[PDB]
Amino acid sequence: ASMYAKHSAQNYQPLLPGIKIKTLVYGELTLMTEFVMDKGSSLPDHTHPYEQTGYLVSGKIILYIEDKKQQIMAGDSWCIPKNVHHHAEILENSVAVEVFAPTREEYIKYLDRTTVV
């Protein structure tokens, strides 16, 4: 059931305007995605029944979680509990790695199978 995946510049897939996604790996309890986000894009306010914990690999965003707002730079991190409202403004081209728990089955369809193993 273990997985390895290798980095590739290909197959980051459209999710929302300005936001591309790739599911890297997943398991019994978690699922890992990489989000590639264009400067000036945004994530609209949403909720989902998965805890979402992330790390900014590169760039700069403003991450809104309920009534908090924080500027996020490379190496910063966050944890958003299940069903909590969140959104973001993307200030520079940015890359984030985010892990969902429980496994977010709807995101398995973004798995880049050309780079698994």
The residues that touch its own copies, with contacts defined as CB under 8 A, are 1-7, 24-30, 32, 34, 51, 53, 55, 57, 63, 65-66, 68, 70, 72-82, 84, 97, 99, 101-102, 117
In sequence order, the β-bridge partners of residue 110 are none
Q: Are 39 and 88 in contact (CB under 8 A)?
A: no
Shortest Cβ 16–its own copies spacing (Å): 22
Answer yes or no: are the C-beta atoms of 115 and 9 closer than 8 Å: no
> How far is it, in rounded angstroms, from Cα 33 to Cα 19?
12
- Give which of Cu ion, its own copies, none residue 51 binds (C-beta under 5 to 8 Å, depending on kind): its own copies
Q: Give the binding site for Cu ion (CB under 5 A).
A: 52
